[PDB]
User: Fold Mandelate racemase / muconate lactonizing enzyme, C-terminal domain protein from Pseudovibrio sp. JE062.
Amino acid sequence: EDCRISRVELYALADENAPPIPWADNQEPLLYTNNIVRLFTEDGTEGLGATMSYTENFFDRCIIESLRTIVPGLIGKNPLMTQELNNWLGARCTWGGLPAKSPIDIAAWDIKGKKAGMPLYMLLGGARTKIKSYASTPMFDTVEEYFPYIDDCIEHGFTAIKLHCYCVYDKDVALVEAVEAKYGTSGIRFMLDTAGFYTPEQAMKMAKWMERHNWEWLEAPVSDYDFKTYQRLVANTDLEISSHGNCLLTLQEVTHALSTGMWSDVRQDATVCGGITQLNKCFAIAAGHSKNLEIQSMGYTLTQAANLHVALAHDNCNFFEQFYPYEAFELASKTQIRTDKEGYVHAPAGNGLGVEMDWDAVKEASFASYVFEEG
Amino acid sequence: EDCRISRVELYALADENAPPIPWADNQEPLLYTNNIVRLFTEDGTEGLGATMSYTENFFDRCIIESLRTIVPGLIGKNPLMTQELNNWLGARCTWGGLPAKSPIDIAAWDIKGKKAGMPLYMLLGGARTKIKSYASTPMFDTVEEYFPYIDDCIEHGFTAIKLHCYCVYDKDVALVEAVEAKYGTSGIRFMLDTAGFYTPEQAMKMAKWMERHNWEWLEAPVSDYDFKTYQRLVANTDLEISSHGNCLLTLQEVTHALSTGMWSDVRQDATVCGGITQLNKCFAIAAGHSKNLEIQSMGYTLTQAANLHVALAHDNCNFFEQFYPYEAFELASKTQIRTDKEGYVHAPAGNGLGVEMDWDAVKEASFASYVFEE
Amino acid sequence: EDCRISRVELYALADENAPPIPWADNQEPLLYTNNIVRLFTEDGTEGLGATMSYTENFFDRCIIESLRTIVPGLIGKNPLMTQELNNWLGARCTWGGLPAKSPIDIAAWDIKGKKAGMPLYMLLGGARTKIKSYASTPMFDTVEEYFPYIDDCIEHGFTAIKLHCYCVYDKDVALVEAVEAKYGTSGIRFMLDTAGFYTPEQAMKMAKWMERHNWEWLEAPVSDYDFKTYQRLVANTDLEISSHGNCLLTLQEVTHALSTGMWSDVRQDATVCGGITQLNKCFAIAAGHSKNLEIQSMGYTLTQAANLHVALAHDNCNFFEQFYPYEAFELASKTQIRTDKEGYVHAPAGNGLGVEMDWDAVKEASFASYVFEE
Amino acid sequence: EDCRISRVELYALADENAPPIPWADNQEPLLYTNNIVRLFTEDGTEGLGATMSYTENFFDRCIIESLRTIVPGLIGKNPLMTQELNNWLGARCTWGGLPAKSPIDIAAWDIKGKKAGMPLYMLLGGARTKIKSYASTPMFDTVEEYFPYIDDCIEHGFTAIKLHCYCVYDKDVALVEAVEAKYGTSGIRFMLDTAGFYTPEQAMKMAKWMERHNWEWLEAPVSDYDFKTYQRLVANTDLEISSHGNCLLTLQEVTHALSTGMWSDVRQDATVCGGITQLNKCFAIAAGHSKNLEIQSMGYTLTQAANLHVALAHDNCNFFEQFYPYEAFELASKTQIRTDKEGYVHAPAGNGLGVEMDWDAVKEASFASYVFEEG
Assistant:
């Protein structure tokens, strides 16, 4: 089996009527966009990969138009040989970097999973078939607005909730303290994402507070490149500190980060750091350092599917990221990844990534597209 | 100041016929694209700024497309408050990252320089009017093809030349040994760019070899992310070890790189690390660590000017990067930066970047453009 | 995906008429043993896993007897969930340690690769279909005996050979120096394994020497637990220093060593560090340190296949270890991994490990066996 | 000294009716094997050493079989030269390792002690002849069951007791908090063994709770190979962090751990790290670092006796590990180490190890034997 690549289809889509969601105070409303890479083989088998985008003013054409300059060479290559593929992608020169490549890698791993006749978490090595999830929230203007949502999260079954906030200490302090006071004895594990905008002193104060109240983790306290402040936070508190997850992408930077005590864990997204190939590697690396890889799976169903499978394949990962409500990120998807009353989220029934989709709906949803074929 | 941006133009241009410049061996012919950003203010004044792209199969729209999702918010902002603007650019989400944003920062300063009535290097400081340059070479199928090019460089006035090689240890050994045999005694300072392709074992060998012959520096020995190999190279050789210059862009990454001994210098490009605002900063950081910043100024004329002006503002930079022959990179430019018989480039006459473009010519070769006003 | 284990078979086999292979000076001749594990799923699909033993006086039963304690719990487990299996094995008590557990994890992976109709190197990644190999040598009483053997390897197609020596500095010098004299300009890559019996002073002297003469790597210079010596060797020579490969097996110990500058590479055996599951993970860890995992595949066909698949799966690994001559270690097997005329070893055409064993011959050569079932 | 080895006997023995003692949660009950070595000299002197085993399903032959490949070369060698012997043992290839080689080195020292007409502790030093002892507890399904066990230990004369918990943080908290309540004002020193199963996060929390209440030590909080967590615990608490004692066995590893501040003590068993020869050296090493070597002496009378002497020979070691009740581990022994009313354990009266065995009973319980001799 010297499998071959015969066709590729690129899709950039979105929803005009979907809600923009800026997870940062006084910050223009972000427009989300799903960049999709569809691969065909000469035997008919198709594999899917995807990574999203968030921009202001318009929908993102950056990734798709970078993928454009990458994919022509994919023709006649073998998707099952996913390593030399990944390697080959590292060579292709663009300013889209690793995020614009991930889909291709992911989409190939989808093919392997299918021709093997088994889901992806098995090929990497099955550890479990489901996993506890937490809910990533939108940013509300007032504090009281969180309570109705949070209650709806507890009703739904979630066992943990990660707050997206204003990212302005004083504002977040009221949000955080008021939540503690109300849901402190709930059992629900709470997380906090400050998108790296705090000052170091604000980071420490929040981290101290959260630690005393046994909150789960502080994500992105400051700039991912403020190495020392990260080291200081991990050194002076027992609270799990986590990176923003889209800045230090290489296996080396991860290695270096864990080696120098910058992170309590590792935050990585298969759709950004190079696909399954690289994500799967970071799990092992994190294990080496006796730590977990808390996946960043917020995104459209292909973005979450890709991350899920890898997490299921290993033990060193506590949660799967669930953006509640769903709908928004189910755009043109026959497949739907959701959470039960137990608080668990399961692998799809299908093989490969386990994600079938509707190509009429994406065809219409996409404002930009491309095709590359044999002839 | 009531100064405000009234309009912004984006261009992505290229020369269909121009020859591709393949760095390493087996690397497919690359198509070079120039992503210009033109600004206008309400009082007529005009700001220029560009960054470049190199792709396969098609000229690049990836950058200009990033710029598109960024620029709308510029209308109404004051380009003279350049730090505020830079601060503002950091919050613009986009996979185009720091390179897409640099042309803007640059353009702002270009306006600043024109309204000041001064060349940009006077605004940042004022150390020198001219700087020694080195010739940044093509890549020739055979080693012999390098000899006449070098002969041409030396006759032209270059006192330094930086070889772009096959980036394959064993084909670079003959290249380097051959060049040294002949020109080793000429007086010409040689450099080498390996585009981060070597294994740690090969970089050390090559480095040692270079050290023994007094070559000027070894650039991009391995992946810029292999921190320990860089540390090792710097610790066990007196050779100058520079990075690839397009990976560790942030001030923090830089402060850390020098702090831990990864680098002999800092290799940065204003058109990549976030504009003049950022490059100008890294210069002082470099000084603080008692090192030089070596401007990665290979690119089109605007790219050159942005880097040259910062370099002339400070003492701690040895050369300006001159790709040679010039022609390809002077696409649609009423201004030419070139090296004189003594091996110097000079600050272009004029204020700001000191660069003028032929706007007919850019549009003629502009395969993508956007206009924003309001 | 209800997939059960129906039955396990355990074999401990060897050969009376086989040449004992002592790789240390005057240490009694070691008798070899292949400890095999055969898994059966409820659909008749067979899993194949093995690890070897080297002992004196008698053939080893230590490992299979350890396996006995472990395997009963396998019945009614799913071998496709390799990771929860590896986890399960972790918390099972035997002084047999990880080497005793490895074979089961392998077999589980062989089954998985078989139900997917795929060779293992495809499941894990898929980098190459072939990798260069090196002949691991026996130990000859006299130095002269190495010369005919080496020629045979060169005649055969090998491009590298790892000399096993006397592991006594003074005599080893006689070897290395005599060999380099004969085959120095050959282009063949020589390695040396000293089984960690050298004093520190001795190892440094040997390393400086090998460094001068561009030898590939030094293996087990001293006790794998003498960290500082290792650090010192790597700090003070450009020579690839390798561990013995059978002492620091945990993912954390690998990570620590690479983080503290102890090893130039990582030496690990899938049939020792806890199966394919673990080795696979040590490849990644190594890639993150910008280093290779040079596999230990010195053993029977089943051990060869396990390590070969993982090495093929990834990029960061230069060589596969081929003990020469073959026969001895092809005991009871229909599959034959061998180096071709160009020094390459390929992956078996079969899926999973692609290893087929002569089940008649194994029962014959088996001197100890157990069977467990529902 | 013409003193040569004339004969050696190997034994693997056990008891069906003895109660199985599992210290882990859900792990199938562990069966306890005792692997014995009996060296004979030409002049008739007898040598006794042992190391135990714990396995599921069946009794262990792993060690006896390892020893089967090692001991044939013993014939002719001189035990009185224990160092050259231990050096000899280091170079014998077995996956059985130092645990399989340990009892041989112990047997030699016994033959020396007997020829010298002296207690082993007198050959090595002689700090004192009795040491305080603590009781290693079994595992009880229920926390309530610990209470009558403890009350018995306090009546028997134990001044300290090491609790074997469930190794599940949450279940261990109900246990620990409960014992502190009824026994917090006893004067009894409490320790805890979690066999490296806690997450580093839980480890920190336990250790801090333990530091609060002045518990003596926390043993094997996490994998012995997660060096940073050990360093982190030792650096951020004044609680004694000890290792599992069965993983890092070499002198080099011990030297390194203390050098890089991983341990507050060294935990080593003579029957695992390679005999008295090696344990004795580790005491000297630990003294060099002003720390103590807290012996792991849980096992049959022979495993107990070996470790005891070494610890009686030096000053830096606070306790002897008595598993209680004794009966099970006195299997086939004419000698019995036990804790007098005052919480001290004394050295056997004999020479060498001071341990006499009942050979009828060993051959009677030995489910697998071997015999080796000259011509």
Observations:
- The first strand of chain A starts at residue 5 and ends at 13.
- Chain A is about 35% helix and 20% strand.
- Chain A touches chain C through 38 residues (CB under 8 Å).
